[PDB]
PDB file of C-alpha atoms (C1' of nucleotides) in Angstrom:
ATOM      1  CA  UNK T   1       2.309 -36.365   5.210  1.00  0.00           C
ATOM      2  CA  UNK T   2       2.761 -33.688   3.038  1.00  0.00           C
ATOM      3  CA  UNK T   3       0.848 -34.261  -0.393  1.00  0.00           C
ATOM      4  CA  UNK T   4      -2.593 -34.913   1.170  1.00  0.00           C
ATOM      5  CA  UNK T   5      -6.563 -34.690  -0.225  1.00  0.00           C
ATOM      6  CA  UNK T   6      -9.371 -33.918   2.183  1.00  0.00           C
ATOM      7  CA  UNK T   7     -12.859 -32.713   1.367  1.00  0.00           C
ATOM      8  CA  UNK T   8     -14.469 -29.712   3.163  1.00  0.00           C
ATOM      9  CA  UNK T   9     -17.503 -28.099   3.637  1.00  0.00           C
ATOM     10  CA  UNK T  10     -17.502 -24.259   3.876  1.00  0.00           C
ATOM     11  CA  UNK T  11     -20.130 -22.218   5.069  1.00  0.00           C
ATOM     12  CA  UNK T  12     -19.936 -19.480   2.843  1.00  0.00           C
ATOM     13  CA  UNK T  13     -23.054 -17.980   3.827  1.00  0.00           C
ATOM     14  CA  UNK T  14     -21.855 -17.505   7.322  1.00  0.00           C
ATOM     15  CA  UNK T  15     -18.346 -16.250   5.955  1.00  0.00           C
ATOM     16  CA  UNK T  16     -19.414 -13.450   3.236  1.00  0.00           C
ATOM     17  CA  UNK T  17     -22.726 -12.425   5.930  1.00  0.00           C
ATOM     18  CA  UNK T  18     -23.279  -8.209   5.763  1.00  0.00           C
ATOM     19  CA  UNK T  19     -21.079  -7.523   2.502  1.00  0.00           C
ATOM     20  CA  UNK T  20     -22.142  -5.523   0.085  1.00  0.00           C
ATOM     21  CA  UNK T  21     -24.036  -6.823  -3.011  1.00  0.00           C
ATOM     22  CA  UNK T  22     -21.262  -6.294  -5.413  1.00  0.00           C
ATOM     23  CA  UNK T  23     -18.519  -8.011  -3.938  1.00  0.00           C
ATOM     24  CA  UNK T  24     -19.968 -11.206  -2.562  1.00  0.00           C
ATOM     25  CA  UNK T  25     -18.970 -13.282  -4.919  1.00  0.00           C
ATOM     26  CA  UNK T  26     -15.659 -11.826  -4.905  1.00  0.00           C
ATOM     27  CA  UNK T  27     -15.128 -11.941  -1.137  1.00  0.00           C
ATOM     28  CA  UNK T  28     -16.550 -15.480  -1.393  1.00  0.00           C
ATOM     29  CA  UNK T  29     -13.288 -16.494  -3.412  1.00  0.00           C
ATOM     30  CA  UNK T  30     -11.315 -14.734  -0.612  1.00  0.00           C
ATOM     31  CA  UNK T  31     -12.953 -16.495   1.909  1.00  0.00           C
ATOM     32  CA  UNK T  32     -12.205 -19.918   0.202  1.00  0.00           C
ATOM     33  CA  UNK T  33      -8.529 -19.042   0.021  1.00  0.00           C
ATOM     34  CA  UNK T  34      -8.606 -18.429   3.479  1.00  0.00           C
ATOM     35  CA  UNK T  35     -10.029 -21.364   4.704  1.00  0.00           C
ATOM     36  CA  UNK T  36      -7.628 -23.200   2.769  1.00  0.00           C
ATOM     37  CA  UNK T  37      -4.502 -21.602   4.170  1.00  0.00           C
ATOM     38  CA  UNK T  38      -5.647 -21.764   7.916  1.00  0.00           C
ATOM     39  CA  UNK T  39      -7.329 -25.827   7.021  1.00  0.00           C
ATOM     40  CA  UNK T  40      -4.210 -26.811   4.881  1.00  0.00           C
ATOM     41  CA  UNK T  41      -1.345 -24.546   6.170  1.00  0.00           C
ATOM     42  CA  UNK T  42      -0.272 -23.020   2.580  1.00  0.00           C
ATOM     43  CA  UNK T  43      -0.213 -19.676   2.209  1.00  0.00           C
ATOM     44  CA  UNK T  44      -0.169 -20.433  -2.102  1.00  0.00           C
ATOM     45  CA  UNK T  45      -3.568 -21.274  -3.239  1.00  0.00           C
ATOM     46  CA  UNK T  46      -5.131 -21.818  -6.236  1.00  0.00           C
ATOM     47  CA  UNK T  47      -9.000 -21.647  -7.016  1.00  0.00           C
ATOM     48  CA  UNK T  48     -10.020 -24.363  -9.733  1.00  0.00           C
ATOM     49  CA  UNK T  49     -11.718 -22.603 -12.724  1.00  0.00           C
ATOM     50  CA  UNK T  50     -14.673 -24.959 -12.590  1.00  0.00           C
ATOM     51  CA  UNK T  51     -14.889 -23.811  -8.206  1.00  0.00           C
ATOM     52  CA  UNK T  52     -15.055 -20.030  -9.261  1.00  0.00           C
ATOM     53  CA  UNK T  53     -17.670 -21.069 -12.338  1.00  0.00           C
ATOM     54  CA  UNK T  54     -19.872 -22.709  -9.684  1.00  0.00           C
ATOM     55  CA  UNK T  55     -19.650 -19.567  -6.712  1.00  0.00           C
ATOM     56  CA  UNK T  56     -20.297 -17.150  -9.708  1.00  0.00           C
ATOM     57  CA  UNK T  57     -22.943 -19.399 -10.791  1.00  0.00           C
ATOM     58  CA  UNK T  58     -26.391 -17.711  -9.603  1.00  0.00           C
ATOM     59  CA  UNK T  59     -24.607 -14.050 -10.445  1.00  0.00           C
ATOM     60  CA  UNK T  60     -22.348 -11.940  -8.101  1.00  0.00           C
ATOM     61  CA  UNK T  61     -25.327 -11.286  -5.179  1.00  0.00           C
ATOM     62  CA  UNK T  62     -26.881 -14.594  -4.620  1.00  0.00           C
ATOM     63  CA  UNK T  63     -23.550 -16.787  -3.623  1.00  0.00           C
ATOM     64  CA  UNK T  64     -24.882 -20.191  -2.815  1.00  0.00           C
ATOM     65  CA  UNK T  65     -24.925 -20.692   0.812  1.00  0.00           C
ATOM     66  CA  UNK T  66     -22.596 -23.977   1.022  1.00  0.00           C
ATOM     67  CA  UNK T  67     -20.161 -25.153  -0.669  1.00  0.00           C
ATOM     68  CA  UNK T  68     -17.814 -28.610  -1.250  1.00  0.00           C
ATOM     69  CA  UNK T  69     -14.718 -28.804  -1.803  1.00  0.00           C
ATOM     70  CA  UNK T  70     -11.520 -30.649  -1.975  1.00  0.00           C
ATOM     71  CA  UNK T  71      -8.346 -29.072  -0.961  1.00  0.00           C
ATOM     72  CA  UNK T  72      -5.525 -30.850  -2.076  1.00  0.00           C
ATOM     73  CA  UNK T  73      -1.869 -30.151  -0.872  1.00  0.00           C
ATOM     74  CA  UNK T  74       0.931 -30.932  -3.239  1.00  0.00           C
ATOM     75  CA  UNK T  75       4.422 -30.154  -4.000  1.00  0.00           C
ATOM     76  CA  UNK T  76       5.310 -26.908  -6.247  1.00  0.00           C
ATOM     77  CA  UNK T  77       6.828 -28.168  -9.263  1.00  0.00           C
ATOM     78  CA  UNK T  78       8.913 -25.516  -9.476  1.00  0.00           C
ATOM     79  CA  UNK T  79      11.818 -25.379  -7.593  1.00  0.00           C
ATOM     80  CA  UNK T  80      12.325 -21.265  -7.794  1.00  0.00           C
ATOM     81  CA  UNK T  81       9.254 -20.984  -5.401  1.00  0.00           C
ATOM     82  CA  UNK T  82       9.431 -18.983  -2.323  1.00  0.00           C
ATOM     83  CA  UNK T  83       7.314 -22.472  -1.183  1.00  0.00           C
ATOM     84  CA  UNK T  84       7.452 -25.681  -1.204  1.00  0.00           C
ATOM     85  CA  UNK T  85       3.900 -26.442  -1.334  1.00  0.00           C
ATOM     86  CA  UNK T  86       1.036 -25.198  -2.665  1.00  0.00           C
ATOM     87  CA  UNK T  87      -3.107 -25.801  -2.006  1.00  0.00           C
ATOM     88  CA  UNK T  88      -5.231 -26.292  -5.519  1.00  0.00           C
ATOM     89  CA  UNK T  89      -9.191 -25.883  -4.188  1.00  0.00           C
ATOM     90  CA  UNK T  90     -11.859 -27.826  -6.383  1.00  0.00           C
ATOM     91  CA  UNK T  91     -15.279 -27.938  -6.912  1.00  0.00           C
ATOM     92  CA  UNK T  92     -17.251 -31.171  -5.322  1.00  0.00           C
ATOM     93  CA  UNK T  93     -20.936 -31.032  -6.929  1.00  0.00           C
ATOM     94  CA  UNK T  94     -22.909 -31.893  -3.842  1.00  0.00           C
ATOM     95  CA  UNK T  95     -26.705 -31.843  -3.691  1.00  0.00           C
ATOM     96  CA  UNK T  96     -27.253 -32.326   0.157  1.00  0.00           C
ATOM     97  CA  UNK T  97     -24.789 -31.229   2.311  1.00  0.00           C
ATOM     98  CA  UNK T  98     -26.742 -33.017   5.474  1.00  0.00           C
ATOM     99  CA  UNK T  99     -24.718 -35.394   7.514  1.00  0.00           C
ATOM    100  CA  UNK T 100     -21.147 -34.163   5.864  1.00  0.00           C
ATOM    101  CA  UNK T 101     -18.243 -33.797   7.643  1.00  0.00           C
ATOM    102  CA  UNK T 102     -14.451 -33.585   7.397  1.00  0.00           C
ATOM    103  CA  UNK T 103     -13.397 -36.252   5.115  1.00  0.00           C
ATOM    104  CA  UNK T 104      -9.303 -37.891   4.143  1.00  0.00           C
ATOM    105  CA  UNK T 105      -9.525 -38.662   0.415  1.00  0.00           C
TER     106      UNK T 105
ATOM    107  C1'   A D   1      27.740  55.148  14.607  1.00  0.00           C
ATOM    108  C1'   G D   2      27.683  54.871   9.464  1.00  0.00           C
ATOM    109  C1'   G D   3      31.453  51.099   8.749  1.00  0.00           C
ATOM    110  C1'   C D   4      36.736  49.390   8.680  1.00  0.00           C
ATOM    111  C1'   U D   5      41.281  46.342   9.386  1.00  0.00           C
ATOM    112  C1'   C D   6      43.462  41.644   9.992  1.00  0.00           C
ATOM    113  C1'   G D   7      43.234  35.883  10.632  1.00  0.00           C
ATOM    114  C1'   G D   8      41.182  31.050   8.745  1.00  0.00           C
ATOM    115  C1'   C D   9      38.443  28.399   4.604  1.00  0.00           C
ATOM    116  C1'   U D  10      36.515  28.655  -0.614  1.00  0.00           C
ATOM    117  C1'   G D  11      37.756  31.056  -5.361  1.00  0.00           C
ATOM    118  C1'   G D  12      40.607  31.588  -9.841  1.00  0.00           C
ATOM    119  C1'   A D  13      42.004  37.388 -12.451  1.00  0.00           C
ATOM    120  C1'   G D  14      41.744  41.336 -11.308  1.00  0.00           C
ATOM    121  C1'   C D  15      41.960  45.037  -7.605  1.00  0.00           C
ATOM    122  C1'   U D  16      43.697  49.609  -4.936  1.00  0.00           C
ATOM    123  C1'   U D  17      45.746  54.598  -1.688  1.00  0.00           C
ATOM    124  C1'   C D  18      45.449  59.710  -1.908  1.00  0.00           C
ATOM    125  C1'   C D  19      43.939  64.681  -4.667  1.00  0.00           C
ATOM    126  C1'   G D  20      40.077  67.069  -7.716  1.00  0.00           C
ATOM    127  C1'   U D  21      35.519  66.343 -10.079  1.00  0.00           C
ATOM    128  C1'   C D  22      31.186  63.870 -11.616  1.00  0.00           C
ATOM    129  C1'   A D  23      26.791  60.594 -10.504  1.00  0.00           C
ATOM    130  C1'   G D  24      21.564  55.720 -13.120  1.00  0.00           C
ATOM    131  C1'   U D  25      25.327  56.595  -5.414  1.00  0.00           C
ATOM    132  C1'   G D  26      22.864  53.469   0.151  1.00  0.00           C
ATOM    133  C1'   C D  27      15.874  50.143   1.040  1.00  0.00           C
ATOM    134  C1'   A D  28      11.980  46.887   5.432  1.00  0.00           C
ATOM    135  C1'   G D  29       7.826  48.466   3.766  1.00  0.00           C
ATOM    136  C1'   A D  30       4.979  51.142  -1.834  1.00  0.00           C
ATOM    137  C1'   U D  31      -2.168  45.018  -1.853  1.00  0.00           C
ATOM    138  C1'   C D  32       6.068  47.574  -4.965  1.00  0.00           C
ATOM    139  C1'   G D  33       8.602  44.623  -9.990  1.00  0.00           C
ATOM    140  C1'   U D  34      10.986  39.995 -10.777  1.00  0.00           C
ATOM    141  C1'   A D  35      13.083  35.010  -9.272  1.00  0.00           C
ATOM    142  C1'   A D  36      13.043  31.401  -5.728  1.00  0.00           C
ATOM    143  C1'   U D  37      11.237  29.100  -1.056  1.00  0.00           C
ATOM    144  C1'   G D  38       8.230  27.947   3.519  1.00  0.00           C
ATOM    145  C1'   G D  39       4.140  26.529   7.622  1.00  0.00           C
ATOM    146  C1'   U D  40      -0.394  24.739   6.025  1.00  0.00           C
ATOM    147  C1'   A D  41       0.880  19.097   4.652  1.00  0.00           C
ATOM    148  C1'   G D  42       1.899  13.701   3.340  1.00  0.00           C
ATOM    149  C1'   U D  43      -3.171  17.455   4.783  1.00  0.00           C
ATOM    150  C1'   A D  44      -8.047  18.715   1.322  1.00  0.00           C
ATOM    151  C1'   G D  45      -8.543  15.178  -1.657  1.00  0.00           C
ATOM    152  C1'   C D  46      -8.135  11.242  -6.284  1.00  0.00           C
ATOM    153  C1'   A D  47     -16.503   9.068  -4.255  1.00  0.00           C
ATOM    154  C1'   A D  48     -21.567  10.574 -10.994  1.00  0.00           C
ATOM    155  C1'   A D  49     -22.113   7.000 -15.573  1.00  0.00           C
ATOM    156  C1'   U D  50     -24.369  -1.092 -11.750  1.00  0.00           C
ATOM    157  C1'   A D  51     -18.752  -5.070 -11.910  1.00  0.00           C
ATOM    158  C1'   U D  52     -15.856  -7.697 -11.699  1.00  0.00           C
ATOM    159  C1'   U D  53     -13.681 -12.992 -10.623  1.00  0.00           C
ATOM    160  C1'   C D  54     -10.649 -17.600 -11.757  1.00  0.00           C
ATOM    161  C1'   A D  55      -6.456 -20.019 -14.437  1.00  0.00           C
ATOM    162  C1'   A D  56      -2.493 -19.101 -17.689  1.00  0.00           C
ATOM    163  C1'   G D  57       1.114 -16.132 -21.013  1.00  0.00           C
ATOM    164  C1'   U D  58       4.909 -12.379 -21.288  1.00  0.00           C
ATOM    165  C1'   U D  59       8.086  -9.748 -17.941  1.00  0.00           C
ATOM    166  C1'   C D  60      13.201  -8.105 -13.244  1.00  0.00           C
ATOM    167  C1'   G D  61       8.348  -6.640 -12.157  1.00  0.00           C
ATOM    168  C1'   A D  62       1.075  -7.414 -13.623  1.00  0.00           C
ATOM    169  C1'   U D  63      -5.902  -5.364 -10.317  1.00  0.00           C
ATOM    170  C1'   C D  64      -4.787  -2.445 -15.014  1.00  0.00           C
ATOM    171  C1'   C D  65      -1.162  -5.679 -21.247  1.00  0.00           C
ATOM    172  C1'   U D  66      -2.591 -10.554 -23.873  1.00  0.00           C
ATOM    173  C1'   U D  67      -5.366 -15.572 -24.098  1.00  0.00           C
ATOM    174  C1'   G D  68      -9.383 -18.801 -22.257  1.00  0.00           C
ATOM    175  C1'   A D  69     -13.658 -19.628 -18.745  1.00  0.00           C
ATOM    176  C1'   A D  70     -17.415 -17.164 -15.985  1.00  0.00           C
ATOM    177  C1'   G D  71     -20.563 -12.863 -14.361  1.00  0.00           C
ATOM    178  C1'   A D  72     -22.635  -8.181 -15.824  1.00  0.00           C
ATOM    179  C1'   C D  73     -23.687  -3.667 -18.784  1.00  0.00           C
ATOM    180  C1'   U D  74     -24.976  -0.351 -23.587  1.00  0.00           C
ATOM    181  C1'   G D  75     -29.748  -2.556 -25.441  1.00  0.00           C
ATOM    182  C1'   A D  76     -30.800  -0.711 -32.602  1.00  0.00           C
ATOM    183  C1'   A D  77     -33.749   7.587 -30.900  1.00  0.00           C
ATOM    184  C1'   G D  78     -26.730   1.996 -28.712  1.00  0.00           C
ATOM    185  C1'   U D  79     -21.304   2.364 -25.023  1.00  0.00           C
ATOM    186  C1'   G D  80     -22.894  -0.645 -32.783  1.00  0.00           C
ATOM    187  C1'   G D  81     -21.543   0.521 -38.097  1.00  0.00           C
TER     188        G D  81
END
RNA sequence: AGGCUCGGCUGGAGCUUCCGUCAGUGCAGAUCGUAAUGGUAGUAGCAAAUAUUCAAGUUCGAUCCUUGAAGACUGAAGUGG
């Protein structure tokens, strides 16, 4: 119940709309962390190197407008955490984001 | 009245009455000299030169140090040598 997988789709057109041109890639991460702590109830999260490649992929102006991922909850490996848990975010390469919904993996 | 005496506390080595006489002898000011300190005030402000992000390392401690990945800039009459 606790280390779970679920794939997302996050509207990260909607979520970055009216900021400025050099920090909406930036405040696109930041929006991804956030959806992952209010989705997944962690408030440690971790971006995937290959999910930050991909919103910084058409520069730091033109974020793509969706995005899929898969937020997966697991158990912080070390015991000297304020936490128990942590959320790692990855990137799902997805071509047509039509018909997509909330998925258990 | 100028000022003075005593009490209490602090302090640790000098001070004092009266008689003459002497003077670098009395401060609120001089945009006074010098030293220190206020309200202003946690205020004005720290806005030129496009721009940073993710993961990790070290550390008591990382936006700023180091590594890797990405995105940008100088653009050879350079932010190079």
């Amino acid at each position: 119940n606790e280390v779970v997988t679920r794939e997302y789709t996050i509207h990260i057109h909607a979520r970055i709309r009216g900021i400025g041109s050099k920090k909406r890639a930036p405040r696109a991460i930041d929006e991804i962390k956030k959806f992952a702590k209010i989705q997944m109830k962690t408030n440690d999260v971790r971006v995937d190197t290959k999910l930050n490649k991909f919103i910084w992929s058409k520069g730091i102006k033109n974020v793509p407008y969706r995005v899929r991922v898969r937020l997966s909850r697991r158990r912080n490996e070390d015991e000297d955490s304020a936490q128990k848990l942590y959320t790692l975010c990855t990137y799902v390469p997805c071509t047509n984001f039509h018909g997509l919904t909330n998925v258990n993996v």
